[PDB]
Write a protein that binds this DNA or RNA. Structure first.
Ligand SMILES: Nc1nc2c(ncn2COCCOP(=O)(O)OP(=O)(O)OP(=O)(O)O)c(=O)[nH]1
Ligand SMILES: [Ca+2]
Ligand SMILES: [Ca+2]
Ligand SMILES: [Ca+2]
Lengths: 267, 1085
DNA sequence: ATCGTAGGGGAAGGATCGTATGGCCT
DNA sequence: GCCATACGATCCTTCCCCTAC
C-alpha cells in the first residue's frame, strides 16, 4: 500500500473524543485526503461543515499521490466513518486505511481491529470496506484572513444562538459595535458583550482587532446545525474582506469542527 | 321470363349522393376552396380511364376491369349455345339456405326436388370450380337436421304416446309462441321416430330408447331446443345441417374434388335454367346426396382468384391532422389499391388503383414495375366517393375473388368500407357476396363482450385471410407494423408515408396523388409477397379437410369446434349420443427445484414425445370409459382389466382397451398422422423452407394437444374434468418415476459403464455425479459431470430408449433431445445455455421477451455472449462460485471480470450522449382487454392509450401492442401531468410514458436514469445465479463497476468561489492543489 | 362465443418497524 | 438518561405481461 495509514489507540482516543459530539452529519460526507491529512466536508442545511485531521493526529499517516476524494458510504447505508461514532463497537483497537492502485483508480480499504476478552487482533473481517476514487470532483474550502477573532465560551450559546433564527424577517444583524464592544442587537434581545480584545462574562477576549464588522447576515438560520453538531463553543472567524463575507464557527479542542455560512455580499 | 330470386345488388342507378373535396374542380380561390362538397346529384355514375368515360353498370363489350360474371340484372351475357358439361369439380366452400315450394313454383324443378321441400326445406349449396375454369354451384336436397330426446321423460312429463301426437304437441306449442312468426307450422314439418341409443357419459350407462326428431328448418330446431320444455335433456341439439350432410355420407369433405354420378334409380342431376339462378356462378345443378362421389385422383387446386386490397383515407374537416372517422361524412377514402392474382401459378394478373380525382403515377414507379415484368397498372378516376365505392363493389361482385387478403383489413379496411357503404349511402350488401341476395356480409369485433376473443368477418363464398393474424403467430416481434415485418422476414427496407402529410399531398397536385398511389401499390405488393411466402390457404384447407368443417370456421371459430366435430363421427359410428349442456379448475404439471448456478459440465436433456396424447392412448381415458362409483365394474379382474386411480380425493376406474376402446384414442391417432407426415420432409431437402414446416408441425402439435384442453374446459361443451386431471396426475407420476429411476440406477460408479461399453472411451477425470437438476412437466435436465460431451448423444439416446422400454408402456417414448455444454440456471422456466453444436438457447429471460427496448436487449446479449464465449471471463465466473457472495462484498473481484466492466462503462457512455436514437429506447405493451375492464387502470400503456384517444389519433385495437417511451421528469412535464389529472378527474409515478411520435415531434428528453436502472436490473437478475441467487449483493457488485461518481456542487459553486474559496482537484491537476490543502489546513487547524 | 395449468418479474399500494434526536426531563 | 416523532426502509398483497410447458 503506497498510502497506507495506521491509526493506533493513542490517537484513537483523541479521534473518538473528537467524534463523540459528532454522532451524525459526518456519516453522509466527503473525505478529501492528501499529503497533509484528511478533511471531512459536508453540506448540512446548506452549511459548510468541515472537520480537519492533521498528519500529527495519525501515528502512521502517509501519502504518495495527488489529492483524492472518497465518499464515506459503500454500497449505501454503510459509512466508512461508522467506526468513529459513540460506542457502536466497544472494542476499538486500531484503524487501517489502505489506498492502493493508480492515480485515477485509487481504492480505500478499511480494516478494523477488536479488543476481545483475551486479544487485540483483527478478528473482525466481515466489516472491511472498499471504496473507489471519486474520479472527477471539485471541492471548495473557505480560505482567507480570519479577521477579528474571539473566544466564545459554552454559556454564551444560550443567547447568541437562541435569539432570532428566523431568516431576514427577524435577523440577528451581525455586528460588533460602533464604540468597540461585541453587542449584537438582533431585534429585541440585545445581547451585550464587552469585547476587550487582548493583544468578566461580558468580555469575549477577542483577537486581531478590527471592531468594524457590522454587515447584516444574508439570512438568519443557524441554530439547528450548531445544535446538531453539539458544539460547546468556539471561535468566530470573519471573511468580510472577500466580496462575499462569510462566518466560520470553529469549535474548541482537538480536531474541532467548523460550520461555515455566507453573509450579505452587498458590500 | 323473369328472375325467380330478386337481385339485391345494384345493377341500374340514376340517383346518388355526391360528396367530394372542393380542391379538385378548378383549384378555386381560398374562399371557395376549403371544405367538402355535399348534395344530391341526379345522373348515372361513371368512371374515367385514360381519357375514356364509361358507365360503371354497363356490362357488355368494352370495360376497364376484368369480369367473370355471366348474368347481370336478369340479362344473360353469355354466348349463344353455351352448355358446358360438368363431371368433376373442386368445391372449396359450403353454403346453407332455406327454400319454399311456393317461391320455387315458377321454376321447372323436378317432382323429387319439390316434394322434399314442399312446406319448407334446407338446401346445401357447394361452391367450386371446374377444371376448365367455370364457376359451379351445386345444390343438394334431402338433408334435415335431427336431435335426440329421452322417450321416458316425454312420456312421463307430457304423457303423449303415438309419436305423431308428439309432433302435433310441438306444432301446437310453436303456434302459441309469443312471437307472431311461427304461422303455418303443422305436425307434417316434424318426423319423430324411435331409436336405440346409449349415452356417452360414464361406463355403467345402459342403452335406452330415444325419440329422434327430424326438423325441416333451421330456426325451428333452435326455438324448440331453447323454449320448448327446457326441463328435458336434449342430445346433439346444436349441430347444424352442414355437419349432418357431411357426416351422413362417408368420405365427404368440405374442401376437395367431387364427381357427379347417376343416382340410385338411374337418376341424374338437373341443370338449372339460367333465369332461375340463385348465385353468380356460370352453371348450376340440382341433385341429391346420392348423385355425388369423392374423386381421389385430382389433388391440385383449380384456377382460383386472389384479391389483395388496401384502402387509404384523408380527414376532410377541421384539424386535418386528426385520424379519419368512418361516421364523419367529411372523411373520405381517397384511394384503393387492388391486386388480382391467380392461385395456381402465384403470378400477377391485374393491378388496379381506384383514385378520387386525377392521379398520374410517376415514371420511376412504372419503369421499376416494367423491369420486373409486372403488368402495367390501370388507374380509374372518379368524381365522387360513392362512384368509387360502387365501382369497387361492382368489381368484387363481377370478378368474384374466391380468396381475399390484405393487411389489417379485419380491423380497419373492411369496417371502414362497410360503415361508409351502409351508414351513409344506405346500400344493401346482403347480395354482394356470391349469392344473388339474402346472403351473409358482416364483421364481428371483440368489443366489451368477453364471449368473443377474435375479430371475424363472414362473407358467403369468399375466404378472407388477413395477413396480420398469420404474421402474429408465426414470428416474434415487438412491433407488428408493416415496415417492421417487411424489414424482418423479407429483409426489404421499404419507404413509408404517414397520415399527417397525406392532406398536403392531396391538396398539392396530381403528381403527389401519383406518389401516394405508388406507395399504396408497393404496400399491396409487399402484402402479396408475404401471402405467397407463407401460403396460409393450404394449411387451413388441410386442417378443414381433416377436421370436417368449413375453411372459414377453421380460420375463425376456434379449437373446440374441430375436436367436437371430429368426435361426433365416432360417436355416431359407435352408437353413442353426445348430450348438450350449454379460476383454476384442477391441478396441472409439476416443476422441479432448479439448482441455479453456472454449470460447466455437460447437461443432457430428456423429454417425452407427445406426452398427453400418448398418456390418453396408452391408459384408455375417455368419456365412455369412466366409472365414478364401485360395484359397477366389479365383474372384471382387478388391474388386468381396469385401472384404478386416485384423483382429487376420488377413486376412478378406467377399463382397458380390450373391453371398451376410447373414443379419443382414435381422434389422436388420426391427428398425429398429419404431424408425422409433415415432420418427415424437414430433413430431406430444405435450405430455408424448413422454417415454415416447423411452424406447420407446431400448429399440428397444438391442435393435437388441444384435445386435453377440450376435455378440461370448465363450462364448455361436452366437458369432463376427470379425464384432464387424470392425464395431469399420470404425467406427474411418470416424471417422478423417471427421476427416481435415473437417480437409483446409473449413479453409483459403474452401472452406466456396464450397460454401455461405449462409456469406456468417454470418461473425463472425476467421479460420476449423474443427477437431475431441473424438471418441467416432461423435460428432465441431467448434469453428467466427469464425462466428455462428445460421447453423450448416442449414449443419451440409448439411455432414453432403455428408460422408455423398462418404465412405460407404448406409445409413450422418451428421447434425448439436446446436450448442453455450458448451462446457466436462473429460476423455473428461465435459463440460457449453449448447445454442443454451437447454437445458443435462451428461454424465459427478458432477452426473449417482447416488452424490452433495443438498447437493453443489445447490451444483455453482448454480456451473455461475452460470458459464454470468452475463456477468461468464463473461468473467472467459475472461480466466483468457490466463495460465498458475502466474501465477494469485501474482496477484490477476479481479474477475469474486466470486460464486463468495459461493457458496462461503454453502455453508460452510450446512454449519456447528445442526440440519442429514440427508437432504441421504446418499449411495447400488449392491450388484451377493453380499457373499461381494467381494475388497476395504472399500467403505463393505458396512459398512452388515453393520450392517443384525447388528441384524436389512431386508437389501437384490443389485440395490438402499444409502444411508448419514458420521458424525463421536468417541471413542465409535472405541470402537464397535474393539469391532465385535474381536468380528467414527491417522486412521480412511473406512468411517464409518451407516444414515440409525439416525443420525436416535440423533442422531449428521455429519462436516462430510468433506462440505466432497468439495464442494471436486467443485468443483475440475469446473472444473479453467479453470486448464489442473491439480488442485493449482485446489484451492489454491478453498481461498483460503474464510474458514475461525479459529485459537483448543486449550482452553489459560484457563490463560494466569489467568497474566496480555493479549488481542489477538477481541472487543477497540477501540484498547487496539494499546497491548497496546506492552505486549507492552516486556515482550519 | 368457445384449449388447459404452473411459474417469474415489474409496478402501485398499504401497513410495519429501527432509528435517527430533540421538546422535555433538567 | 429521556422520549418523542417524523423520516426511512422493509416487507407483504394484488393485478397485469409474456413465457414455458
Ligand atoms: N393443453 C395444452 N397443453 C400443452 C400445450 N403445450 C404443451 N402442453 C403440455 O404438454 C407438455 C409438453 O409440451 P411439448 O411442447 O413438449 O409438446 P409435446 O406434445 O410433448 O411434443 P414434443 O415433446 O415433441 O415437443 C398446449 O398448447 N396446450
Ligand atoms: Ca392503409
Ligand atoms: Ca396497410
Ligand atoms: Ca415433450
Amino acid at each position: 500500500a503506497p498510502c497506507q495509514v495506521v491509526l493506533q489507540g493513542a490517537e484513537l482516543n483523541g479521534i473518538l473524543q473528537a467524534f463523540a459530539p459528532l454522532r451524525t452529519s459526518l456519516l453522509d460526507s466527503l473525505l478529501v485526503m492528501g499529503d497533509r491529512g484528511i478533511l471531512i466536508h459536508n453540506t448540512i442545511f446548506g452549511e459548510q461543515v468541515f472537520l480537519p485531521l492533521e498528519h500529527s493526529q495519525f501515528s502512521r499517516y502517509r501519502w504518495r499521490g495527488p489529492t483524492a476524494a472518497f465518499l464515506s458510504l459503500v454500497d449505501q447505508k454503510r459509512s466508512l466513518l461508522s467506526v468513529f461514532r459513540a460506542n457502536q463497537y466497544p472494542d476499538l483497537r486500531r484503524v487501517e486505511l489502505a489506498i492502493t492502485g493508480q492515480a485515477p483508480f485509487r481504492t480505500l480499504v478499511q480494516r478494523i481491529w477488536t479488543t476481545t476478552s483475551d486479544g487485540e487482533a483483527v478478528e473482525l473481517a466481515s466489516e472491511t470496506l472498499m471504496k473507489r476514487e471519486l474520479t472527477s470532483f471539485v471541492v471548495l474550502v473557505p480560505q482567507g484572513t480570519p479577521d477579528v477573532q474571539l473566544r466564545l465560551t459554552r454559556p454564551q450559546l444560550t443567547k447568541v444562538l437562541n435569539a432570532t433564527g428566523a431568516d431576514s424577517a427577524t435577523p440577528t444583524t451581525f455586528e460588533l459595535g460602533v464604540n468597540g464592544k461585541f453587542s449584537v442587537f438582533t431585534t429585541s434581545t440585545c445581547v451585550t458583550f464587552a469585547a476587550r480584545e487582548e493583544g468578566n462574562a461580558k468580555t469575549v477576549y477577542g483577537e486581531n482587532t478590527h471592531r468594524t464588522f457590522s454587515v447584516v447576515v444574508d439570512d438568519c438560520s443557524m441554530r439547528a446545525v450548531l445544535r446538531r453538531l453539539q458544539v460547546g463553543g468556539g471561535t468566530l472567524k470573519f471573511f468580510l474582506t472577500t466580496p462575499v463575507p462569510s462566518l466560520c464557527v470553529t469549535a474548541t479542542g482537538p480536531n474541532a469542527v467548523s460550520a461555515v455560512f455566507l453573509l450579505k455580499p452587498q458590500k | 321470363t323473369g328472375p325467380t330470386q330478386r337481385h339485391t345488388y345494384y345493377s341500374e342507378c340514376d340517383e346518388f349522393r355526391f360528396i367530394a373535396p372542393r380542391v379538385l374542380d378548378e383549384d378555386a380561390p381560398p374562399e371557395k376552396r376549403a371544405g367538402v362538397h355535399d348534395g344530391h346529384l341526379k345522373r348515372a355514375p361513371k368512371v374515367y380511364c385514360g381519357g375514356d368515360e364509361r358507365d360503371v353498370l354497363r356490362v357488355g363489350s368494352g370495360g376497364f376491369w376484368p369480369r367473370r360474371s355471366r348474368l347481370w340484372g336478369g340479362v344473360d351475357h353469355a354466348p349463344a349455345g353455351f352448355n358446358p358439361t360438368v363431371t368433376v369439380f373442386h368445391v372449396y366452400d359450403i353454403l346453407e339456405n332455406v327454400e319454399h315450394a311456393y317461391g320455387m313454383r315458377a321454376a321447372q324443378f323436378h317432382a323429387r326436388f319439390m316434394d322434399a321441400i314442399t312446406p319448407t326445406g334446407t338446401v346445401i349449396t357447394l361452391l367450386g370450380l371446374t377444371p376448365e375454369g367455370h364457376r359451379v354451384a351445386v345444390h343438394v336436397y334431402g338433408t334435415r337436421q335431427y336431435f335426440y330426446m329421452n322417450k321416458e321423460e316425454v312420456d312421463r312429463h307430457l304423457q303423449c304416446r303415438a309419436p305423431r301426437d308428439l309432433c302435433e304437441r310441438m306444432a301446437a306449442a310453436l303456434r302459441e309462441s309469443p312471437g307472431a312468426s311461427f304461422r303455418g307450422i303443422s305436425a307434417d314439418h316434424f318426423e319423430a321416430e324411435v331409436v336405440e341409443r346409449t349415452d356417452v357419459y360414464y361406463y355403467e350407462t345402459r342403452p335406452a330408447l330415444f325419440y329422434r326428431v327430424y326438423v325441416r328448418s333451421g330456426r325451428v330446431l333452435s326455438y324448440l331446443c331453447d323454449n320448448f320444455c327446457p326441463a328435458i335433456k336434449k342430445y346433439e341439439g346444436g349441430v347444424d345441417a352442414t355437419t349432418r350432410f357431411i357426416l351422413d355420407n362417408p368420405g365427404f369433405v368440405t374442401f376437395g374434388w367431387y364427381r357427379l354420378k347417376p343416382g340410385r334409380n338411374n337418376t341424374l342431376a338437373q341443370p338449372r335454367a339460367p333465369m332461375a339462378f340463385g348465385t353468380s356462378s356460370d352453371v348450376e345443378f340440382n341433385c341429391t346426396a346420392d348423385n355425388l362421389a369423392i374423386e381421389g385422383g385430382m389433388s391440385d387446386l383449380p384456377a382460383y382468384k386472389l384479391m389483395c386490397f388496401d384502402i387509404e383515407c384523408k380527414a376532410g374537416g377541421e384539424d386535418e391532422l386528426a385520424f379519419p372517422v368512418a361516421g364523419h361524412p367529411e372523411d373520405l377514402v381517397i384511394q384503393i389499391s387492388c391486386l388480382l392474382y391467380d392461385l395456381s401459378t402465384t403470378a400477377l394478373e391485374h393491378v388496379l388503383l381506384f383514385s378520387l380525382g386525377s392521379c398520374d403515377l410517376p415514371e420511376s414507379h412504372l419503369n421499376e414495375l416494367a423491369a420486373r415484368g409486372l403488368p402495367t397498372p390501370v388507374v380509374l378516376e372518379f368524381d365522387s366517393e360513392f362512384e368509387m365505392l360502387l365501382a369497387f363493389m361492382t368489381l368484387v361482385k363481377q370478378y368474384g375473388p374466391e380468396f381475399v387478403t390484405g393487411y389489417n383489413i379485419i380491423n380497419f379496411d373492411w369496417p371502414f368500407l362497410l360503415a361508409k357503404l351502409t351508414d351513409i349511402y344506405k346500400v344493401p350488401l346482403d347480395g354482394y357476396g356470391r349469392m344473388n341476395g339474402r346472403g351473409v356480409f358482416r364483421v364481428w369485433d371483440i368489443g366489451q363482450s368477453h364471449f368473443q376473443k377474435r375479430s371475424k368477418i363472414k362473407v358467403n363464398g369468399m375466404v378472407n385471410i388477413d395477413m396480420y393474424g398469420i404474421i402474429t403467430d408465426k414470428i416474434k416481434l415487438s412491433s407488428y407494423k408493416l415496415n417492421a415485418v417487411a424489414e424482418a422476414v423479407l429483409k426489404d427496407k421499404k419507404k413509408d408515408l404517414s397520415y399527417r402529410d397525406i392532406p398536403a399531398y392531396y391538396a398539392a397536385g396530381p403528381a403527389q396523388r401519383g406518389v401516394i398511389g405508388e406507395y399504396c401499390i408497393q404496400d399491396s405488393l409487399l402484402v402479396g409477397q408475404l401471402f405467397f411466402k407463407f401460403l396460409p390457404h393450404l394449411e387451413l384447407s388441410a386442417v378443414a379437410r381433416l377436421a370436417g368443417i368449413n375453411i372459414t370456421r377453421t380460420i375463425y371459430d376456434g379449437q373446440q369446434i374441430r375436436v367436437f366435430t371430429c368426435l361426433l363421427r365416432l360417436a355416431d359410428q359407435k352408437g353413442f349420443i353426445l348430450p348438450d349442456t350449454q379460476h383454476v379448475g384442477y391441478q396441472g404439471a409439476r416443476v422441479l427445484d432448479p439448482t441455479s448456478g453456472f454449470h460447466v459440465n455437460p447437461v443432457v436433456v430428456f423429454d417425452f414425445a407427445s406426452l398427453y396424447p400418448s398418456i390418453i392412448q396408452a391408459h384408455n381415458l375417455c368419456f365412455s370409459t369412466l366409472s365414478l362409483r364401485a360395484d359397477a365394474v366389479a365383474h372384471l379382474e382387478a388391474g388386468k382389466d381396469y385401472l384404478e386411480i386416485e384423483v382429487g380425493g376420488r377413486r376412478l376406474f378406467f377399463v382397458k382397451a380390450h373391453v371398451r376402446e376410447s373414443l379419443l384414442s382414435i381422434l389422436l391417432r388420426d391427428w398425429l398422422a398429419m404431424r408425422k407426415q409433415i415432420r418427415s420432409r424437414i430433413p430431406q431437402s430444405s435450405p430455408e423452407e424448413a422454417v415454415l414446416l416447423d411452424k406447420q408441425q407446431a400448429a399440428i402439435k397444438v391442435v393435437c394437444n388441444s384435445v386435453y384442453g377440450f376435455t378440461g374446459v370448465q363450462h364448455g361443451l361436452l366437458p369432463c374434468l376427470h379425464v384432464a386431471a387424470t392425464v395431469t396426475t399420470i404425467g406427474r407420476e411418470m416424471l417422478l418415476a423417471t427421476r427416481e429411476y435415473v437417480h437409483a440406477r446409473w449413479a453409483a460408479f459403474e452401472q452406466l459403464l456396464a450397460d454401455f461399453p461405449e462409456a469406456a472411451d468417454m470418461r473425463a477425470p472425476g467421479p460420476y455425479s449423474m443427477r437431475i437438476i431441473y424438471g418441467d412437466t416432461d423435460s428432465i435436465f441431467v448434469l453428467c459431470r466427469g464425462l466428455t460431451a462428445a460421447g453423450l448423444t448416442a449414449v443419451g439416446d440409448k439411455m432414453a430408449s432403455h428408460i422408455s422400454r423398462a418404465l412405460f408402456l407404448p406409445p409413450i417414448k422418451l428421447e434425448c433431445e439436446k446436450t448442453f455444454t455450458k448451462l446457466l440456471l436462473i429460476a423455473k422456466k428461465k435459463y440460457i445455455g449453449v448447445i454442443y453444436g454451437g447454437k445458443m438457447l435462451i428461454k424465459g429471460v427478458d432477452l426473449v421477451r417482447k416488452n424490452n427496448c433495443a438498447f437493453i436487449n443489445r447490451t444483455s446479449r453482448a454480456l451473455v455472449d461475452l460470458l459464454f464465449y470468452d475463456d477468461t471471463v468464463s473461468g473467472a465466473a467459475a472461480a466466483l462460485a468457490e466463495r460465498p457472495a458475502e466474501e465477494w462484498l469485501a474482496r477484490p473481484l477476479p481479474e477475469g471480470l474486466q470486460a464486463f466492466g468495459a461493457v458496462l462503462v461503454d453502455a453508460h457512455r452510450r446512454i449519456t450522449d447528445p442526440e440519442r436514437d429514440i427508437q432504441d429506447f421504446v418499449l411495447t405493451a400488449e392491450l388484451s382487454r377493453h380499457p373499461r375492464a381494467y381494475t388497476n387502470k395504472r399500467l403505463a400503456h393505458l396512459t398512452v392509450y388515453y393520450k392517443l384517444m384525447a388528441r384524436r389519433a389512431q386508437v389501437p385495437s384490443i389485440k395490438d401492442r402499444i409502444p411508448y417511451v419514458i420521458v424525463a421528469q421536468t417541471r413542465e412535464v409535472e405541470e402537464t401531468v397535474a393539469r391532465l389529472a385535474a381536468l380528467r378527474e414527491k417522486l412521480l409515478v412511473s406512468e411517464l410514458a409518451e407516444d414515440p411520435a409525439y416525443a420525436i415531434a416535440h423533442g422531449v428528453a428521455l429519462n436516462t436514469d430510468y433506462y440505466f436502472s432497468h439495464l442494471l436490473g436486467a443485468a443483475c437478475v440475469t446473472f444473479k445465479a453467479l453470486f448464489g441467487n442473491n439480488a442485493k449483493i449482485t446489484e451492489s457488485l454491478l453498481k461498483r463497476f460503474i464510474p458514475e461518481v461525479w459529485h459537483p456542487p448543486d449550482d452553489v459553486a459560484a457563490r463560494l468561489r466569489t467568497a474566496g474559496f480555493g479549488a481542489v482537484g477538477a481541472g487543477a491537476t497540477a501540484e498547487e492543489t496539494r499546497r491548497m490543502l496546506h492552505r486549507a489546513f492552516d486556515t482550519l487547524a
